[PDB]
Amino acid sequence: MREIVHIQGGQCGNQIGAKFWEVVSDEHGIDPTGTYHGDSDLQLERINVYFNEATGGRYVPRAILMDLEPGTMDSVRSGPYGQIFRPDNFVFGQTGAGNNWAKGHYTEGAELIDSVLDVVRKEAESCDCLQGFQVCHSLGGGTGSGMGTLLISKIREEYPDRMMLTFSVVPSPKVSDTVVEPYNATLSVHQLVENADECMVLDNEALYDICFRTLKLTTPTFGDLNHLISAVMSGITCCLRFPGQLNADLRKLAVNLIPFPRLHFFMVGFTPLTSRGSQQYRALTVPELTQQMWDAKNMMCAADPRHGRYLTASALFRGRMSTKEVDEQMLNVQNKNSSYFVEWIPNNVKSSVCDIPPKGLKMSATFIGNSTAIQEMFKRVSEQFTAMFRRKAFLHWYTGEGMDEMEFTEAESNMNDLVSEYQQYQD
Amino acid sequence: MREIVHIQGGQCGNQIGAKFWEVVSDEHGIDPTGTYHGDSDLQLERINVYFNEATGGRYVPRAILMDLEPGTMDSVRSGPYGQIFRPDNFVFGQTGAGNNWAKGHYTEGAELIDSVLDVVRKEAESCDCLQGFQVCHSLGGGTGSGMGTLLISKIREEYPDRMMLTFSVVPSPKVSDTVVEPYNATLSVHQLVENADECMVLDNEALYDICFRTLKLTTPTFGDLNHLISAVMSGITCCLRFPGQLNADLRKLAVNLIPFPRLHFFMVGFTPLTSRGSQQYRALTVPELTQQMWDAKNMMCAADPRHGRYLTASALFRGRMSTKEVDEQMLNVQNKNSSYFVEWIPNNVKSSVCDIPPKGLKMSATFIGNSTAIQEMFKRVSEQFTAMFRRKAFLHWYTGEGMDEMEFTEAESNMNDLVSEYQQYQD
Amino acid sequence: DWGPRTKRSVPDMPKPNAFDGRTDLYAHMQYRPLSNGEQGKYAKAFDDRGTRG
Amino acid sequence: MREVISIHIGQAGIQVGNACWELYCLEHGIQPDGQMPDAFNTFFSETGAGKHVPRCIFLDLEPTVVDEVRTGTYRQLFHPEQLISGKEDAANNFARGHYTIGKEIVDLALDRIRKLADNCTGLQGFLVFNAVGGGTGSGLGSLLLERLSVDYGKKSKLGFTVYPSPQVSTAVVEPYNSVLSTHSLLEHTDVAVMLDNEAIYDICRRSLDIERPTYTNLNRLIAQVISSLTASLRFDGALNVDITEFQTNLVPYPRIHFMLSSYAPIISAEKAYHEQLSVAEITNAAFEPASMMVKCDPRHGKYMACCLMYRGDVVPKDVNASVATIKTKRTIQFVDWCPTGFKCGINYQPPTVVPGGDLAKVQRAVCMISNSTAIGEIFSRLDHKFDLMYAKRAFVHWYVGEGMEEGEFSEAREDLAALEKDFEEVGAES
Amino acid sequence: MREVISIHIGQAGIQVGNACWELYCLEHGIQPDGQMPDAFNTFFSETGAGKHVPRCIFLDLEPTVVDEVRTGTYRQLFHPEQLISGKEDAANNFARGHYTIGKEIVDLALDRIRKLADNCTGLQGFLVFNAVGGGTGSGLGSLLLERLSVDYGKKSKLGFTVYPSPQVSTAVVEPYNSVLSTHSLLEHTDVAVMLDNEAIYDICRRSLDIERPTYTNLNRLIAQVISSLTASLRFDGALNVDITEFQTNLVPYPRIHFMLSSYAPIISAEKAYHEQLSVAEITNAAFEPASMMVKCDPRHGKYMACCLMYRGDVVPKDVNASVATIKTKRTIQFVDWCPTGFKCGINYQPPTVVPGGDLAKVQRAVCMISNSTAIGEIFSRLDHKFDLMYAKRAFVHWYVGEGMEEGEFSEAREDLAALEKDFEEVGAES
Ligand SMILES: Nc1nc2c(ncn2[C@@H]2O[C@H](COP(=O)(O)OP(=O)(O)OP(=O)(O)O)[C@@H](O)[C@H]2O)c(=O)[nH]1
Ligand SMILES: Nc1nc2c(ncn2[C@@H]2O[C@H](COP(=O)(O)OP(=O)(O)OP(=O)(O)O)[C@@H](O)[C@H]2O)c(=O)[nH]1
Ligand SMILES: Nc1nc2c(ncn2[C@@H]2O[C@H](COP(=O)(O)OP(=O)(O)O)[C@@H](O)[C@H]2O)c(=O)[nH]1
Ligand SMILES: Nc1nc2c(ncn2[C@@H]2O[C@H](COP(=O)(O)OP(=O)(O)O)[C@@H](O)[C@H]2O)c(=O)[nH]1
Ligand SMILES: [Mg+2]
Ligand SMILES: [Mg+2]
Ligand SMILES: [Mg+2]
């Protein structure tokens, strides 16, 4: 009877949750009209983690979709499985943050924060036991990063004993989508360390690559990319919604994966990724779900895990599986390559099994990895930020909404501080 | 529970090895679809030696199919029994070696040797305990010669204790399908001495001679020639995949037939060969098989057995038979002509019996001999190598890819060294 | 209670892919068996680009 | 509801605007009378039952370019008070459009902009169309832009202006009229998109294989660039680009705000069948200087910030691979301090084709608006043209006698001289 | 995928390419308009909705021959930009095509090459078609060939050119343009294959028994060689021979890359029934000097490498028996240091017969392309014709005035003289 409240911001956040709540819905067997027509009794046992029961069998999520433009919700208005949401929980803006981190945070940010936090507070008091708050947003943008990161700092003030899952996408190293991309990213990670308790790192270039070499797709849309992200988000809370032989909730991963409070940036992975051409030939047994779990190609982050040591890792298995085959495969990966794991921590791997697989798959598993290789991602964004700030280019906008260069120097100071302690632990 | 990893290299290796997977799947009762339809219980008892279990009862070969051109992969998959292979195991490039040993071994093999080691590892630690690796290629081209022998050198360093059986076709004395055979053949064999542990030498125009005067097939295509080669390949591991009265796996043929570590080149033969109109006149008796097995015209390499003495030989008889007829006609073939056998090795032959005969034949045997007359096929390559190298013709393609002329002379010395160790055993 | 939907409604975007019509990743994420009328396409080709050979 | 107001000033403004609003009524299905047989709110104002009014005004002192709109095929479309005429033109004089006859009509110009701004619910920016060659587009545009920053602060103002070509120009006091305009469009207009008539003459020559281009053909694909610029508001796509998103991505410094323009697919009705139009082909076509819409060579300067707005069947992956192939080319060289030069926008609406037009129906199109240091070649050449003519006081008594003084030539010259210093200083590698 | 760009330079390259692509469109079933009613990707680009365009450019300075293609039956097959023209021809001047008038078009030629190279995912070679008799085929041919080497390094450039015949010559300054082309075609084309008009005249006279052939009859069987060499890329066979396999098996040295050509079953329609076409018979036919497509006798020289390419019902057995009888013949001489001489390739596609062509429908075909020392007689005869004309400076004022200098005629003379010594050196027994 523990609960998770879902909050989302920006273009990137809303499009993920359009697919994320879609993927959750047919796992639980509820129609886009909201009625339940599932064939399994185990689906209705833990619904309250993600849905409010309503009159007539309607189920409405704990979804609070935040944006500063009506464009994102318009896609949610008309997209598939977009009618399940609460109309009152669509807080909206009119001006738009305009891809500016200063506009979403300080000046135009304050006019909507008092309204979006009212929607959060109404849902927080309605459910009894709050496991934590889950946010999905971007970092290089300004609407979901600028307004989102202030919202995370505020909600840690009101609820300091509750965990914080953030699924924030990251500026790609190879390619770029916006021009103020390193500016809005370094200001957000500077705030994400202080407020958030655990972070899942995503980026489109790894989601693009994982759709090519592992899925054999040469035309991946964003809706194809959002599905693989949505499979990861269902895998974290698969223990809450379904039973298992060994149970690991959200707070159990927090004590496992976080040795020190600032080292909460993880990398994700989803195991049964089979192309349709090679779908029949592969078998589904625990040793071959593990061999795709630890592959560097299966990681949905920029960082190559072969570069840096694994400080702590977690695995969220789903399915009817032997407990030895879960145990022995994750024990073999501690002996075959022990140079990639940290010596001064014994048994870096957290494992948990849930007996209810996803729809159709006989077995599945989700990987969360606290690697020190994530410093390669943070170094590159800090490299771009120092290049543009020393010329003070694109800075006359951010100083226009009420910023001075003091926190810009502070953002690089904390960025250089957090990457310094990763490389100190790698030695 | 002893398994073999199959590797196919180049146009010759893919075409030969595709023919290899019908002759072993038919005797294991695997349909072209991929399911099982055999009427015998003994077929499924040992199927892990070549096949990997898949979902739905499917069986897939443990064959990494490797080349540098996409044309042959499309041709192999489009043929009958070509849909059983995994698309992930079809590893290939786009440029093509183009009958150039330097392009295969050094330039264009380097961007693909990382991809082929990734999948031959994935077929190695997936299975229980490796008996060895089997590769089939050509020594005349550049795709299976250069980039094929590069794989053997890499896989011998990674797995040093495993067995290595190579089926390589060698250039003809009489005719010449390409122009740069002896450059490709001398460089490939020099890499093949230290790396590989066995080498079943084949020649295409010994096969044409077999198909003309004995089989009486007036229009032999490559479907004919690969079919004779594939029968020998099924004969070596015949006692692995099926029970036998006297047991002999692939390593039993190693210690019996390799006197000295560089003395490991063999030549092959298949005994129950008669033309289609003359099948009624042949009585399938054990002495009938032995007179064809030891005949010069039946042997599948260009070397003539009467020119040199037999260091060691082996006969792998298949079918229901009496084991003393496996004994005296191997004794009598030494007593009748002892001048053609080595005096200082007594009982130069090894015999084995597998009680499951191949399909359509009730009595068969595959001959593995180690004659010192195999120096003839090496020295006719060597006399062609010295002719072209002294004028440095057709060399700028090889030295345009980083290969200095020093290693050409190094490979020449080993070829003259390997005909030196053979020459002193016939005296 | 909702107003009129803004920003139009584009028809057939993103397009159904050639070499079998794929508008979703449900087949891969649900592990559905391949149909017999569509198995030949993946028998002939490796990637989702159609009929190269 | 989002909305953008377009003001059309000078002879170039209306003739673009006739081509601009022709492209707009075919996208929404609105007939020329104004009747559609939910996304028109960006440009059209719904009134009554089945009537749509363009949210634009035609402001020109010469009545003989506006009256043909008032009697053409678009009589029932425009509001008659939006069409603002005058007694006599400014006669390519900056002093007449700014001091003598400009002030007598700009009061009526603000009277309808306030009416258009009051009818707007949510405003994101302004569009201005003018030519700095003629004093109506140059002087009255300077007067209206200076007044609008006082009247409507901190709002976006998109500058679609046309500059004299190096080898081609159709007026004599164009070096005089362009330099005085640069004192206003520097400090007031926030985004300025240069256009150049001879570069579009060359674009229509080779890509559209038209041997004899006219002013109608040039303005038709001028309408294509602006419609592609604001197609993100009207239709839905993978990556939307809003007006204020467009302004903070390409303006690194408040004075370095002039940007280029490039529309990649210009294909004929007979070459459309033979070209294999993919997102890799059009993206490489946009960065070609042949497709550049201003007569400047980008190889001399450094690209500094670029946006690529895609229309049609553009899937998000290979467009992200198309940008990577542009970055690897040594010819397209970016400035050192900007490792992230690209902005991307994808809309799902293929570009409409006007019936009887010259462009062919394409399923993919990209419009690039890029900030570069090669635009200093545009200003420095017009600086040399002004400095040679001013040195012997040519055509000064026309300008001075209509209210001006000699001191405004020195201030405008010094202001433009700072731009050439600013472009060299910013683009210098450190 | 496998792809190849075929460039055609000069007037003689056009009617060759006019005769190639009419056979290519027939062999893949492409209709003349350009619509097929997977193997076409080597030469045709899939464009939009069921349309194919040839991966080719038809560049020539004289606008007459290219405009014949524009108004011909293949007006819909070709992209209109690929048919590149010019204002005036080089007019039998290597000076004009390489220095004065060739520069204005070679930039436009390389631009479309970059467009075609970008479209193809794997480029295996460039097929260059020219004749060294004319200015455009030699001057513009050398300028494009030099530029294509730098821009696309380490890529095969397959040179298919026509040298002047010993007896029949249609121009006077053909000795001058042949020697100047030889300095450039030596160091730029990786592999060159000669053709001579005299031998093709004799082939049509003896084999096809047509008394008065024209260039249309010449280029049709030229194209039958063209398809036979690229036969491996488009259709599967037992022994594939790619373009990159074609080079590394035939040239023993970089400076010796001039090779002959032959075609075996050149039989008319009435004589095809009586002849028994076996692999043994046509292989003996291909090695005869009558079947040689270049007017030299191979008996004077020595074969250093041969590459036989087979099409149709050919088993791999009898091709080895046929080669064995060829090797045991004593009039056919191989060089002593190359025992392994033959590169054998067997495609399974029988040759296609064009309607109206003199060639008959045959099940088997052999195209033999072989390097030999008998090609040293070609360069000596063109040298002797050049040495006589240059002795007292005939036809030099045309070349000197149009850019060239006097001294570099001796440089091409010494370069051709070194080619004479190199053929004598490589054939000397050791
Ligand atoms: N592209 C384009 N440019 C135009 C068009 N009409 C005029 N121009 C440009 O405008 C310049 C002339 O200055 P204008 O601003 O049009 O003169 P005006 O607007 O009549 O100003 P006044 O004469 O004072 O009324 C010429 O050099 C043209 O380049 C047009 O229809 N299309
Ligand atoms: N095989 C063949 N050769 C041709 C043909 N037409 C011309 N030639 C050869 O071309 C040589 C002369 O060059 P041309 O192609 O006619 O003219 P060009 O090379 O384009 O040079 P310009 O006329 O100045 O443009 C002659 O010696 C002919 O041998 C043809 O149709 N077939
Ligand atoms: N996975 C995914 N990422 C997206 C999508 N749309 C935008 N993004 C990412 O969001 C980043 C830009 O941030 P932006 O959307 O402007 O953030 P916003 O200003 O808060 O809306 C880019 O790096 C994109 O990769 C989407 O539909 N799916
Ligand atoms: N037994 C057999 N030999 C073949 C076949 N195809 C080609 N060969 C031999 O391979 C040699 C040419 O090598 P090649 O095919 O180019 O090898 P690659 O470079 O690895 O592709 C010739 O001498 C043929 O004798 C086949 O189907 N069966
Ligand atoms: Mg517990
Ligand atoms: Mg006027
Ligand atoms: Mg000509």
H or E stretch at E286: helix E279-286
> Residue D401: how many CB atoms within 10 A of its CB?
11
In 3D, which of A387, A89, A42 has the Cα closest to residue A238? A42
Cis peptide before C16 (omega within 30 of 0): no
Question: Ligand 1: which residues within 6 Å by Cβ?
Answer: D 10-12, 15, 61-62, 89-92, 131, 133-137, 162, 169-171, 197, 215, 218-219
Q: Kindly tell me the burial class for residue B298, based on how many C-beta atoms sit within 10 Å of its own C-beta (0-12, 13-18, 19 or more).
A: buried
Q: What are phi and psi of B375, to 5 degrees?
A: -65, -20
Residues E152/E126, Cβ–Cβ less than 8 Å: yes
- Among protein residues, the one with the nearest Cα to ligand 2's atom 27 is E133
Distance CA A56, CA A37 (A): 13
Hunting for tokens 């979902």 — which residue is that? B55
Bridge-partner residues for D292, per DSSP? D262
Q: Do A276 and C9 touch (CB under 8 A)?
A: no
Residue of A nearest to B62 (CA): A281
List the one residue out of E347, E396, E343 whose CA is nearest residue E371.
E343
Asked if the C-beta of B160 comes within 8 angstroms of chain A's C-beta atoms, the answer is no
C-alpha distances in Å from residue B97, one per residue of A396, B143, B398, D94: 57, 5, 11, 71
Round to whole Å and give the CA distance between E381 and B290.
66
DSSP symbol at B124: T
Helix, strand, or coil (residue E315): coil
Q: Cβ distance D163 to D178 under 8 Å?
A: yes
Residues in chain C closer than 8 A to B89 (CB atoms): none
Q: Whose CA is nearest to atom 5 of ligand 1?
A: D12
* Residue among A5, A337, A353, A339 nearest A162 (CA): A5
B142 burial (CB, 10 Å; 0-12 / 13-18 / 19+) is buried
Asked whether the beta carbons of E219 and E19 are under 8 A apart, the reply is: yes
Name the pairing type of β-strands E157-163 and E191-196.
Answer: parallel
Kindly state the DSSP code that residue D207 receives in the 8-state scheme: T
Q: How many CB atoms lie within 10 A of CB E315?
A: 17
- Which has the closest alpha carbon to A46: A160, A315, A270, A38? A38
DSSP E strands, E133-283: 157-163, 191-196, 237-239, 258-259, 262-263
Contact A139, A145 (CB under 8 A): yes
- In the block, residue with structure tokens 């089939």: B136
Q: How many CA atoms lie within 13 A of B139 on its CB side?
A: 26
**Residues A86 and A111 sit within 8 Å (Cβ to Cβ):** no
Tell whether A337 is within 8 A of chain B (Cβ): no
C-alpha D314: how far from its chain's center? 25
Q: What is the spatial distance between Cα B272 and Cα E389, in angstroms, rounded to a whole number?
A: 75
Nearest beta carbon to residue A77 from set C5, C29, C31: C5
Ligand 4 centroid, distance to B205 Cα (angstroms) = 12
Structure token pair of residue B25 = 């799947």
* Resolution in angstrom units: 3.7
Q: E196 near E294, Cβ under 8 Å?
A: yes
Q: Please spell the DSSP secondary structure of A38-64, one letter per residue.
A: -S-SSTTTS-TTTEEE-GGG-EEESEE
Mark whether D245 is an active-site residue. Answer: yes
Could you tell me which of A231, A226, A236 has the C-alpha nearest to residue A75? A226
Quick check: helix, strand or coil at residue D243? helix
Q: Are A172 and A130 in contact (CB under 8 A)?
A: no
Q: Which helix (H) or strand (E) holds B247?
A: none
D 286-315 residues inside an 8 A Cβ radius of E: none
Separation CA D221–CA D201 (nearest Å): 11
Experimental method used, please? cryo-EM
Distance between CA atoms of residues E56 and E37, nearest Å: 22
Neighbouring-strand partners of residue B299 = B269
Is the minimum CB–CB distance between B386 and chain E shorter than 8 Å?
Answer: no
The arrangement of strands across the sheet holding D364-372 comes to D262-263, D364-372, D303-312, D342-347
Q: In angstroms, what separates the C-alpha of A22 from chain C's closest C-alpha?
A: 11
Per-residue tokens: B2: 């002893």
**Cα–Cα distances in Å, from E3 out to B68, B109, C52, D4, E125?**
16, 21, 12, 49, 8
Q: Give the three-class secondary structure for E64.
A: helix
Q: Which two tokens stand for residue D387?
A: 């400095």
**Portion 11-40 of C in contact with A at CB < 8 A:** 14, 17, 22, 24-25, 27-34
**Identified catalytic residue from E146, E187, E198, E245:** E245
Close Cβ partners of D31 (under 8 Å, ≥ 6 residues apart)? D25, D37
The owner of tokens 């030949």 is C40
Q: Tell me how far the alpha carbon of residue A181 is from its chain's centroid.
A: 19
Please, are residues D130 and D14 in contact by the beta-carbon 8 Å criterion?
Answer: no
- Which residue's CA is minimally distant from atom 25 of ligand 3? A204
Name the residue among A361, A217, C52, C39 with its Cα closest to residue B34. Answer: C39
Task: List all residues whose CB is within 6 A of at least one atom of ligand 4.
Answer: B 10-12, 15-16, 97, 99, 138, 140-144, 169, 177-178, 204, 222, 225-226, 229; E 239
User: Which helix (H) or strand (E) element contains residue A250?
Assistant: helix A250-257
- Match 């004590």 to its residue by tokens: A255
Contact partners, residue E115, CB within 8 Å, separation at least 6: none
Task: Give the closest residue to A4 by CA, choosing from A193, A195, A239, A191.
Answer: A239
Residue D235, φ and ψ in degrees, nearest 5: -130, 165
Q: Where are the alpha helices (DSSP H) in A51-174?
A: 70-78, 101-102, 110-126, 143-158
Beta-carbon contacts of residue D376 (< 8 Å; ≥ 6 apart): D301, D419, D420, D423, D424
Q: B179 — contact with chain E (CB < 8 Å)? A: yes
The alpha carbon of B87 is separated from its chain's Cα centroid by a whole number of angstroms, namely 24
What is residue B130's DSSP assignment?
E
Cβ <8 Å between E242 and B222: no
CA–CA distance, B377 with B379 (Å, rounded to integer):
6
Q: Which residue has the tokens 């209109």?
A: E80
Q: Does the C-beta of E11 come closer than 6 Å to ligand 2?
A: yes
B317 is written with which tokens?
């008889």
Q: Return phi, psi of residue B53, to 5°.
A: -65, 140
Q: Which residues contact B184 (CB under 8 A, 6 or more apart)?
A: B99, B101, B139, B140, B141, B142, B145, B146, B178
Helix axes of E103-119 and D279-286: crossing angle, nearest 10 degrees: 140
Residue type, D283: T
Nearest to B135 by CA among B246, B16, B249, B228: B16
Burial of E50 by CB count in 10 Å (0-12 exposed, 13-18 middle, 19+ buried)? exposed
The DSSP letter of residue E136 is I
Chain D residues touching C16 at Cβ < 8 A = none
Residue E143, amino acid: L
* CA–CA min distance E2, chain B (Å): 8
Q: How far apart are CA E43 and CA A34, in angstroms?
A: 56
* C-alpha to C-alpha distance for B14 and B16, rounded to whole angstroms: 6
Say how many CA atoms lie within 13 Å of D245 toward its Cβ: 30
**A71 near A262, Cβ under 8 Å?**
no
Residues with Cβ within 8 Å of residue E38, at least 6 apart in sequence: C51, C52, C53
CA pair distance A298, A228, nearest whole angstrom:
11
Residues 6+ apart with CB under 8 A from A282: A274, A288, B54, B55, B86
- Work out whether the CA dihedral E164, E168, E174, E175 comes out positive or negative: positive
Calpha distance B9→B154 (Å, rounded): 15
